[PDB]
Amino acid sequence: KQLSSKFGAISSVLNDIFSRLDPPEAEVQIDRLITGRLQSLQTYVTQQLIRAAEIRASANLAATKMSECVLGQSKRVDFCGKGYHLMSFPQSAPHGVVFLHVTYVPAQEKNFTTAPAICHDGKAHFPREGVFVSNGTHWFVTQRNFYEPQIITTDNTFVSGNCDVVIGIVNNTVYDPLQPELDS
Amino acid sequence: TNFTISVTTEILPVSMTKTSVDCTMYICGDSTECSNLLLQYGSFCTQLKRALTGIAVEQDKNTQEVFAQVKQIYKTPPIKYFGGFNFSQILPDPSKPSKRSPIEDLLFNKVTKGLTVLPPLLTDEMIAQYTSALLAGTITSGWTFGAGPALQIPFPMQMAYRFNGIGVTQNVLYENQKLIANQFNSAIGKIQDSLSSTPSALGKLQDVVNHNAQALNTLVKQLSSKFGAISSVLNDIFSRLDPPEAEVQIDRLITGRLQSLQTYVTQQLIRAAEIRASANLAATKMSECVLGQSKRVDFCGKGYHLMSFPQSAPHGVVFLHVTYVPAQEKNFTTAPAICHDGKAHFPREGVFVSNGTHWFVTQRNFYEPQIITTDNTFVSGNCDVVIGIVNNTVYDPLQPELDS
Amino acid sequence: QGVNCTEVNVFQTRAGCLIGAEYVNNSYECDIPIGAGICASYQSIIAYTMSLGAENSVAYSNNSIAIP
Ligand SMILES: *[C@@H]1O[C@H](CO)[C@@H](O[C@@H]2O[C@H](CO)[C@@H](O)[C@H](O)[C@H]2NC(C)=O)[C@H](O)[C@H]1NC(C)=O
Ligand SMILES: *[C@@H]1O[C@H](CO)[C@@H](O[C@@H]2O[C@H](CO)[C@@H](O)[C@H](O)[C@H]2NC(C)=O)[C@H](O)[C@H]1NC(C)=O
Ligand SMILES: *[C@@H]1O[C@H](CO)[C@@H](O[C@@H]2O[C@H](CO)[C@@H](O)[C@H](O)[C@H]2NC(C)=O)[C@H](O)[C@H]1NC(C)=O
Ligand SMILES: *[C@@H]1O[C@H](CO)[C@@H](O[C@@H]2O[C@H](CO)[C@@H](O)[C@H](O)[C@H]2NC(C)=O)[C@H](O)[C@H]1NC(C)=O
Ligand SMILES: *[C@@H]1O[C@H](CO)[C@@H](O[C@@H]2O[C@H](CO)[C@@H](O)[C@H](O)[C@H]2NC(C)=O)[C@H](O)[C@H]1NC(C)=O
Ligand SMILES: *[C@@H]1O[C@H](CO)[C@@H](O[C@@H]2O[C@H](CO)[C@@H](O)[C@H](O)[C@H]2NC(C)=O)[C@H](O)[C@H]1NC(C)=O
Ligand SMILES: *[C@@H]1O[C@H](CO)[C@@H](O)[C@H](O)[C@H]1NC(C)=O
Ligand SMILES: *[C@@H]1O[C@H](CO)[C@@H](O)[C@H](O)[C@H]1NC(C)=O
Ligand SMILES: *[C@@H]1O[C@H](CO)[C@@H](O)[C@H](O)[C@H]1NC(C)=O
Ligand SMILES: *[C@@H]1O[C@H](CO)[C@@H](O)[C@H](O)[C@H]1NC(C)=O
Ligand SMILES: *[C@@H]1O[C@H](CO)[C@@H](O)[C@H](O)[C@H]1NC(C)=O
């Protein structure tokens, strides 16, 4: 639509200008018209360059996302999906790409009584990967994302020092799986 | 043999000042004939108005993306006890009417025609509320508030989990909890004093503000340019010369002003793209450093990253990265494997360590010797394949059980 | 925007003065931005401060944990 701009000339058409005004004097008007058209073209070119740079950055972001959480796992939280990420499915899109992220979302939480460690026989016991939880009268170790109570034993816990330097420790016995074999 | 809890600052710009420019008022002013002559130029003013509105909504979208990371506004408990840890400098102060933290107040104080400066969609009060909600979520609920429902977790076990995230057991944290809390408080005080005493720490935001103000001043001063004409005022050429020459002079002034405004628009678009990239980086850091722990090196500060604090800033965001820095190293003799009864023993998670006489196993990031047993070691092959194996016995905790 | 309507259902904001909208004390998730905290919507046309979200206060304690 910018082609039909006067740009300070008598008309947007140039053949009529050349017919009604002689090219010696119409050269200035034609030069003004073509330099206005060239300025509009340069503005369009600069806008296209800026848009192309932005879309290239977006495409690089999409390529990195497909490198991380499509061809493998992704440990970056809130990078390519809300919540814990499992996988994604790339599908074709018009002049673009779309992602179908499969995410892991926990639900239905419950209250439990926690403890930093367990003091048994004067020695503090720390979980290998879980956390000591209590439902009111018994102690259990559970995963950090799912509820799965288990008896505290020596296989999933390790001993490091005594149980007085730490703060918040409680008293609970630790079942030894090795004992009943040689008890009999 | 020792660690150091170091807190480092990271300032990243978020958004620039949204501006709107009127083409007719800036170029021609109050001249109707000038407006009639400009109306034949096409839709340059419409194009630039569309570009400026796109820039403004881009800034608003960047602010929404970097600040509204959650939909639930969390509140700190009235009992602000977290096992000896102090967070008074980052929590909002009820004494101040602005509900801003002393650190936030310090960062706010340290930062100082046809054109209208549009105010941002999000004010500083709701930005401060967003930062307070993020702090409450990352302190009381841990990192799980950004991945669904918020789960309550006390601070010592959250710090133990964060230490486990960089391969450090919780025993050293629970044996030196008071020392860790005192070091954290000292680091917070030191970084607050450094932010108060260093005017050059706010270089990026001040540079952005100065660039925007200087661009506005240059666009204002471009009206005084004669652009090769007799006068720089349209009134003088309208009331002092014949219309056949006054039309040419008016055309020269309007094309010079249009070129200047096009250059200003191009500079604004380039700066907006740079601010877009910076805001995307800041949003990534907020999603990784604040909403969780990142195993990436140097993404969330120097050294191993534990956690971070998001703080509001004028036209920017300030991060307080909590880092893990080892110190006080000691020379120790090592060996790839231990030979015992013709079997090669390899560590499960650590490395074999020797002080000269005995051999132990310890973690990679901390010194914690332990007796080399079969629980923390696994056997694989014999001893004539590995290179550098030494001779030592492997204790069996099962052996005294049936020895008696 | 940028001027006061006293020298032009009238409401005054920091961004400017708007006519044709009624101020509502309720906080809703807005759709049409205005500026300076105010964010109008259609229900008639109303203007109000935009809502950040539902207010929540987790019961924090030093001996309580939550496991899904
Ligand atoms: C906490 O959980 C444990 C195990 O799930 C409960 O122990 C069992 O409780 C059931 C009924 O509540 C009894 O029939 C079993 O005999 C119990 N097991 C043992 C080994 O005694 C315990 O009751 C739960 N406590 C609370 C307060 O809910
Ligand atoms: C856990 O058990 C220890 C050892 O029995 C308790 O420590 C004793 O506590 C009593 C009074 O609480 C003192 O009179 C003893 O001198 C303590 N003995 C030792 C060796 O420290 C401890 O109180 C118990 N904790 C709980 C929560 O029951
Ligand atoms: C690790 O370093 C910290 C500080 O760098 C040491 O803590 C100091 O301990 C001495 C003696 O106990 C005290 O006089 C200092 O006041 C402590 N400093 C601080 C800042 O609390 C700690 O002792 C070191 N660890 C070891 C094993 O030596
Ligand atoms: C946490 O830090 C704040 C800020 O430094 C401490 O408040 C200071 O307390 C001392 C007395 O202990 C006063 O002399 C200072 O004037 C206080 N600072 C300010 C800014 O008012 C606070 O004591 C620290 N500890 C706790 C548990 O909050
Ligand atoms: C290497 O560390 C071991 C473990 O601490 C040291 O063995 C102990 O050394 C002390 C200091 O003389 C003795 O009191 C203990 O009886 C030793 N323990 C055993 C089981 O013998 C050992 O001395 C250290 N070696 C060097 C060169 O520092
Ligand atoms: C560690 O012990 C092994 C076994 O006792 C040593 O290997 C012996 O080395 C001698 C010569 O050095 C040979 O004659 C034997 O045949 C080897 N025995 C076996 C079973 O291979 C080894 O030298 C010892 N390492 C050190 C450093 O003393
Ligand atoms: C846990 O208890 C607190 C207060 O006792 C309560 O606010 C919260 O809703 C409880 N959560 C669950 C899952 O029962
Ligand atoms: C929890 O905090 C309260 C109040 O600060 C305190 O009385 C109690 O001893 C704390 N519990 C533990 C296990 O430290
Ligand atoms: C370890 O030994 C080397 C050379 O013997 C020495 O340069 C270095 O300082 C020592 N490291 C420590 C911590 O003493
Ligand atoms: C260590 O290096 C020295 C010199 O390069 C060499 O003599 C020695 O055999 C090496 N030891 C091992 C275990 O590679
Ligand atoms: C309202 O008008 C008065 C006087 O005309 C002016 O001083 C004041 O700044 C105006 N209010 C706003 C919010 O601009």
Coordinates of N, CA, C and O in Angstrom, one line a residue, chain B residues 269-386:
Chain B
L269 N 13.6 -0.5 19.1 CA 13.3 -1.9 18.8 C 14.5 -2.8 19.1 O 14.3 -3.9 19.7
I270 N 15.7 -2.3 18.8 CA 16.9 -3.1 19.2 C 17.0 -3.2 20.7 O 17.3 -4.3 21.2
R271 N 16.8 -2.1 21.4 CA 16.9 -2.2 22.9 C 15.8 -3.1 23.5 O 16.0 -3.8 24.4
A272 N 14.6 -3.1 22.8 CA 13.5 -3.9 23.3 C 13.9 -5.4 23.0 O 13.5 -6.2 23.9
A273 N 14.5 -5.7 21.9 CA 14.9 -7.1 21.7 C 16.0 -7.5 22.7 O 16.0 -8.7 23.2
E274 N 16.9 -6.6 23.0 CA 17.9 -6.9 24.0 C 17.3 -7.2 25.4 O 17.7 -8.1 26.1
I275 N 16.3 -6.3 25.7 CA 15.6 -6.5 27.0 C 14.8 -7.7 27.0 O 14.6 -8.4 28.0
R276 N 14.2 -8.1 25.8 CA 13.5 -9.4 25.7 C 14.4 -10.6 26.0 O 14.0 -11.5 26.7
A277 N 15.6 -10.5 25.4 CA 16.6 -11.6 25.7 C 17.0 -11.7 27.2 O 17.1 -12.7 27.8
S278 N 17.2 -10.5 27.8 CA 17.6 -10.4 29.2 C 16.5 -10.9 30.1 O 16.7 -11.6 31.1
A279 N 15.2 -10.6 29.7 CA 14.1 -11.0 30.5 C 13.8 -12.5 30.4 O 13.4 -13.1 31.4
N280 N 14.1 -13.0 29.2 CA 14.0 -14.5 29.0 C 15.1 -15.2 29.9 O 14.8 -16.2 30.5
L281 N 16.3 -14.6 29.9 CA 17.3 -15.2 30.8 C 16.9 -15.1 32.2 O 17.2 -16.1 33.0
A282 N 16.4 -14.0 32.7 CA 16.0 -13.8 34.1 C 14.8 -14.7 34.4 O 14.8 -15.3 35.5
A283 N 13.9 -15.0 33.5 CA 12.8 -15.9 33.8 C 13.4 -17.3 33.9 O 12.9 -18.1 34.7
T284 N 14.3 -17.7 33.0 CA 15.0 -19.0 33.1 C 15.7 -19.2 34.5 O 15.6 -20.2 35.1
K285 N 16.4 -18.1 34.9 CA 17.1 -18.2 36.2 C 16.1 -18.3 37.4 O 16.3 -19.0 38.3
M286 N 14.9 -17.6 37.3 CA 13.9 -17.7 38.3 C 13.3 -19.1 38.3 O 13.0 -19.6 39.4
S287 N 13.1 -19.7 37.1 CA 12.5 -21.0 37.0 C 13.5 -22.1 37.5 O 13.0 -23.1 38.0
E288 N 14.8 -21.8 37.4 CA 15.8 -22.8 37.8 C 16.4 -22.6 39.2 O 16.4 -23.5 40.0
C289 N 16.9 -21.4 39.4 CA 17.6 -21.1 40.7 C 16.6 -20.9 41.8 O 16.9 -21.4 42.9
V290 N 15.5 -20.3 41.6 CA 14.5 -20.0 42.7 C 13.6 -21.1 42.9 O 13.3 -21.6 44.0
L291 N 13.0 -21.7 41.8 CA 12.0 -22.7 41.9 C 12.6 -24.1 42.1 O 11.8 -25.1 42.2
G292 N 13.9 -24.2 42.3 CA 14.5 -25.5 42.5 C 16.0 -25.3 42.6 O 16.5 -24.2 42.8
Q293 N 16.7 -26.4 42.6 CA 18.2 -26.5 42.6 C 18.6 -26.9 41.2 O 18.1 -27.9 40.6
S294 N 19.6 -26.2 40.6 CA 20.1 -26.5 39.3 C 21.5 -27.1 39.5 O 22.4 -26.5 40.1
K295 N 21.7 -28.3 38.9 CA 23.0 -28.9 38.8 C 24.0 -28.2 37.9 O 25.1 -28.6 37.8
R296 N 23.5 -27.3 37.1 CA 24.3 -26.6 36.1 C 25.4 -25.7 36.8 O 25.1 -25.1 37.8
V297 N 26.6 -25.8 36.2 CA 27.7 -25.0 36.8 C 27.6 -23.6 36.3 O 27.4 -23.3 35.1
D298 N 27.8 -22.6 37.2 CA 27.8 -21.2 36.9 C 26.5 -20.6 36.3 O 26.5 -19.5 35.8
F299 N 25.4 -21.4 36.4 CA 24.2 -20.8 35.9 C 23.5 -20.0 37.0 O 22.8 -19.0 36.7
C300 N 23.8 -20.3 38.3 CA 23.1 -19.6 39.4 C 24.2 -19.1 40.4 O 24.0 -19.2 41.6
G301 N 25.3 -18.6 39.9 CA 26.4 -18.1 40.7 C 27.6 -18.9 40.7 O 27.7 -20.0 40.1
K302 N 28.6 -18.4 41.4 CA 29.9 -19.1 41.5 C 29.7 -20.4 42.3 O 29.0 -20.4 43.3
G303 N 30.4 -21.5 41.9 CA 30.5 -22.7 42.6 C 29.2 -23.5 42.6 O 28.3 -23.2 41.7
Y304 N 29.1 -24.4 43.5 CA 27.8 -25.2 43.6 C 26.7 -24.3 44.1 O 26.9 -23.5 45.0
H305 N 25.5 -24.5 43.5 CA 24.3 -23.7 43.8 C 23.4 -24.5 44.8 O 23.1 -25.7 44.5
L306 N 23.0 -23.8 45.9 CA 22.1 -24.4 46.8 C 20.7 -23.9 46.6 O 19.7 -24.7 46.3
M307 N 20.5 -22.6 46.7 CA 19.2 -21.9 46.5 C 19.5 -20.4 46.3 O 20.6 -20.0 46.3
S308 N 18.4 -19.7 46.1 CA 18.5 -18.2 45.8 C 17.3 -17.5 46.3 O 16.2 -18.1 46.6
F309 N 17.4 -16.2 46.4 CA 16.3 -15.3 46.8 C 16.0 -14.3 45.7 O 16.9 -13.6 45.2
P310 N 14.7 -14.2 45.3 CA 14.3 -13.2 44.3 C 13.9 -11.9 45.0 O 13.2 -11.9 45.9
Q311 N 14.5 -10.8 44.5 CA 14.3 -9.5 45.1 C 13.8 -8.5 44.0 O 14.4 -8.5 42.9
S312 N 12.9 -7.7 44.3 CA 12.4 -6.7 43.3 C 13.3 -5.5 43.2 O 14.0 -5.1 44.1
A313 N 13.4 -5.0 42.0 CA 14.3 -3.8 41.7 C 13.5 -2.9 40.7 O 12.7 -3.4 40.0
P314 N 13.8 -1.6 40.7 CA 13.3 -0.7 39.7 C 13.7 -1.0 38.3 O 14.9 -0.9 38.0
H315 N 12.7 -1.5 37.5 CA 13.0 -1.9 36.1 C 14.1 -3.0 36.0 O 14.9 -3.0 35.1
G316 N 14.0 -4.0 36.9 CA 14.9 -5.0 37.0 C 14.6 -6.0 38.1 O 13.6 -5.8 38.8
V317 N 15.4 -7.0 38.2 CA 15.3 -8.0 39.3 C 16.7 -8.3 39.8 O 17.7 -8.2 39.1
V318 N 16.8 -8.6 41.1 CA 18.0 -8.8 41.9 C 17.9 -10.2 42.5 O 17.0 -10.5 43.2
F319 N 18.9 -11.0 42.2 CA 19.0 -12.4 42.8 C 20.1 -12.5 43.8 O 21.2 -11.9 43.7
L320 N 19.8 -13.2 44.9 CA 20.7 -13.4 46.0 C 21.0 -14.9 46.0 O 20.4 -15.7 46.7
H321 N 22.0 -15.3 45.2 CA 22.3 -16.7 45.1 C 23.1 -17.2 46.3 O 24.1 -16.6 46.7
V322 N 22.6 -18.3 46.9 CA 23.3 -18.9 48.0 C 24.2 -20.1 47.5 O 23.7 -21.0 46.8
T323 N 25.5 -20.0 47.7 CA 26.4 -20.8 47.0 C 27.2 -21.7 48.0 O 27.3 -21.3 49.2
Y324 N 27.8 -22.8 47.6 CA 28.6 -23.6 48.4 C 30.0 -23.6 47.9 O 30.3 -23.9 46.7
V325 N 30.9 -23.1 48.8 CA 32.3 -22.9 48.4 C 33.2 -23.8 49.4 O 33.3 -23.5 50.6
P326 N 33.9 -24.8 48.9 CA 34.9 -25.5 49.7 C 36.1 -24.7 50.1 O 36.4 -23.8 49.4
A327 N 36.7 -25.1 51.2 CA 37.9 -24.4 51.6 C 38.7 -25.3 52.5 O 38.2 -26.3 53.0
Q328 N 40.0 -24.9 52.8 CA 40.9 -25.6 53.7 C 41.1 -27.0 53.2 O 40.8 -28.0 53.9
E329 N 41.7 -27.2 52.0 CA 42.0 -28.5 51.4 C 43.2 -29.1 52.1 O 44.0 -28.4 52.8
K330 N 43.4 -30.4 52.0 CA 44.5 -31.1 52.6 C 44.9 -32.2 51.7 O 44.1 -32.9 51.0
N331 N 46.2 -32.4 51.6 CA 46.8 -33.4 50.7 C 46.5 -34.8 51.3 O 46.6 -35.0 52.5
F332 N 46.2 -35.8 50.4 CA 45.8 -37.1 50.9 C 46.2 -38.1 49.8 O 46.0 -37.9 48.6
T333 N 46.8 -39.3 50.2 CA 47.2 -40.3 49.3 C 45.9 -41.2 48.9 O 45.1 -41.5 49.8
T334 N 45.8 -41.5 47.6 CA 44.7 -42.2 47.1 C 45.1 -43.4 46.4 O 46.3 -43.6 46.1
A335 N 44.2 -44.3 46.0 CA 44.4 -45.5 45.2 C 43.1 -45.8 44.5 O 42.0 -45.6 45.0
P336 N 43.2 -46.2 43.2 CA 42.0 -46.6 42.5 C 41.2 -47.7 43.1 O 39.9 -47.7 43.0
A337 N 41.8 -48.7 43.7 CA 41.1 -49.9 44.2 C 41.9 -50.5 45.4 O 43.1 -50.1 45.6
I338 N 41.2 -51.3 46.1 CA 41.8 -52.0 47.2 C 41.7 -53.5 47.0 O 40.6 -54.0 46.6
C339 N 42.8 -54.2 47.1 CA 42.9 -55.7 46.9 C 42.6 -56.4 48.2 O 43.3 -56.1 49.2
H340 N 41.7 -57.4 48.2 CA 41.4 -58.1 49.4 C 40.9 -59.5 48.9 O 39.9 -59.7 48.2
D341 N 41.7 -60.5 49.3 CA 41.5 -61.9 48.9 C 41.4 -62.1 47.4 O 40.5 -62.9 46.9
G342 N 42.2 -61.4 46.7 CA 42.2 -61.5 45.2 C 41.1 -60.8 44.5 O 40.8 -61.0 43.3
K343 N 40.3 -59.9 45.2 CA 39.2 -59.2 44.7 C 39.5 -57.7 44.7 O 40.1 -57.2 45.7
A344 N 39.1 -57.0 43.7 CA 39.3 -55.6 43.6 C 38.1 -54.9 44.1 O 36.9 -55.1 43.7
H345 N 38.3 -54.0 45.1 CA 37.2 -53.2 45.7 C 37.1 -51.8 45.2 O 38.2 -51.1 45.1
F346 N 35.9 -51.3 44.8 CA 35.8 -50.0 44.3 C 34.7 -49.3 45.2 O 33.8 -49.9 45.7
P347 N 34.9 -48.0 45.4 CA 34.0 -47.2 46.3 C 32.6 -47.1 45.6 O 32.5 -46.9 44.4
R348 N 31.6 -47.1 46.5 CA 30.2 -47.0 45.9 C 29.9 -45.5 45.5 O 29.4 -45.3 44.5
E349 N 30.3 -44.6 46.4 CA 30.0 -43.2 46.1 C 31.2 -42.2 46.3 O 31.2 -41.1 45.7
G350 N 32.2 -42.6 47.1 CA 33.3 -41.7 47.4 C 34.6 -42.2 46.7 O 34.6 -42.7 45.6
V351 N 35.7 -41.9 47.4 CA 37.0 -42.3 47.0 C 37.9 -42.8 48.1 O 37.6 -42.4 49.3
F352 N 38.8 -43.7 47.9 CA 39.7 -44.2 48.9 C 40.7 -43.1 49.3 O 41.3 -42.4 48.5
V353 N 40.8 -42.8 50.6 CA 41.6 -41.8 51.2 C 42.6 -42.3 52.2 O 42.2 -43.2 53.0
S354 N 43.8 -41.8 52.2 CA 44.8 -42.3 53.1 C 45.6 -41.1 53.7 O 46.0 -40.2 52.9
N355 N 45.9 -41.1 55.0 CA 46.7 -40.0 55.6 C 48.1 -40.4 55.8 O 48.9 -39.7 56.3
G356 N 48.5 -41.6 55.3 CA 49.9 -42.1 55.4 C 50.0 -43.5 56.0 O 50.9 -44.2 55.5
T357 N 49.2 -43.9 56.9 CA 49.2 -45.2 57.6 C 48.0 -46.0 57.2 O 48.1 -47.1 56.7
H358 N 46.8 -45.5 57.5 CA 45.6 -46.3 57.3 C 44.9 -45.8 56.0 O 45.2 -44.7 55.4
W359 N 43.8 -46.5 55.6 CA 43.1 -46.2 54.4 C 41.6 -46.1 54.8 O 41.0 -47.0 55.5
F360 N 40.9 -45.0 54.3 CA 39.5 -44.8 54.6 C 38.8 -44.4 53.3 O 39.4 -44.4 52.2
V361 N 37.5 -44.1 53.4 CA 36.7 -43.7 52.2 C 36.0 -42.4 52.7 O 35.4 -42.4 53.8
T362 N 35.9 -41.4 51.8 CA 35.3 -40.1 52.2 C 34.6 -39.6 51.0 O 34.8 -40.0 49.8
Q363 N 33.7 -38.6 51.2 CA 33.0 -37.9 50.1 C 34.0 -37.1 49.3 O 35.1 -36.7 49.7
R364 N 33.5 -36.8 48.1 CA 34.3 -36.0 47.1 C 34.4 -34.5 47.5 O 35.4 -33.9 47.4
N365 N 33.3 -33.9 48.1 CA 33.2 -32.5 48.4 C 33.5 -32.2 49.9 O 33.4 -31.1 50.3
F366 N 33.7 -33.2 50.7 CA 34.0 -33.0 52.1 C 34.8 -34.2 52.7 O 34.8 -35.3 52.1
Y367 N 35.6 -33.9 53.7 CA 36.4 -34.9 54.4 C 35.6 -35.6 55.5 O 35.3 -34.9 56.5
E368 N 35.3 -36.8 55.3 CA 34.6 -37.6 56.3 C 35.1 -39.1 56.2 O 34.5 -39.9 55.5
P369 N 36.2 -39.4 56.9 CA 36.8 -40.7 56.8 C 35.9 -41.8 57.5 O 35.1 -41.5 58.4
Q370 N 35.9 -43.0 56.9 CA 35.1 -44.1 57.5 C 35.8 -45.4 57.2 O 36.7 -45.5 56.3
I371 N 35.5 -46.4 58.0 CA 36.1 -47.7 57.8 C 35.7 -48.3 56.5 O 34.5 -48.3 56.2
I372 N 36.6 -48.8 55.7 CA 36.3 -49.4 54.4 C 35.7 -50.8 54.7 O 36.4 -51.8 55.0
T373 N 34.4 -50.9 54.6 CA 33.6 -52.1 54.8 C 33.0 -52.6 53.4 O 33.3 -52.0 52.4
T374 N 32.3 -53.7 53.5 CA 31.6 -54.2 52.3 C 30.3 -53.5 52.0 O 29.8 -53.7 50.9
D375 N 29.8 -52.7 52.9 CA 28.5 -52.0 52.7 C 28.7 -50.8 51.7 O 27.9 -50.6 50.8
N376 N 29.8 -50.1 51.8 CA 30.1 -48.9 51.0 C 31.1 -49.2 49.8 O 31.5 -48.3 49.2
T377 N 31.4 -50.5 49.6 CA 32.2 -50.9 48.5 C 31.6 -52.1 47.8 O 30.9 -52.9 48.3
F378 N 32.0 -52.2 46.5 CA 31.5 -53.3 45.6 C 32.7 -53.9 44.9 O 33.7 -53.2 44.6
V379 N 32.7 -55.2 44.7 CA 33.8 -56.0 44.1 C 33.5 -56.2 42.6 O 32.3 -56.4 42.2
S380 N 34.5 -56.1 41.8 CA 34.4 -56.3 40.4 C 35.8 -56.7 39.9 O 36.7 -55.9 39.7
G381 N 35.9 -58.0 39.6 CA 37.2 -58.6 39.0 C 38.3 -58.7 40.1 O 38.1 -58.6 41.3
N382 N 39.5 -59.1 39.6 CA 40.6 -59.3 40.4 C 41.6 -58.1 40.3 O 41.3 -57.1 39.7
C383 N 42.8 -58.3 40.9 CA 43.6 -57.1 41.2 C 44.8 -57.0 40.2 O 45.5 -56.0 40.3
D384 N 44.9 -57.9 39.2 CA 46.0 -57.8 38.2 C 45.6 -57.0 37.0 O 46.4 -56.8 36.1
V385 N 44.3 -56.5 36.9 CA 43.9 -55.7 35.8 C 44.0 -54.2 36.1 O 44.4 -53.4 35.2
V386 N 43.6 -53.8 37.3 CA 43.6 -52.4 37.6 C 45.1 -52.0 37.9 O 46.0 -52.8 38.1

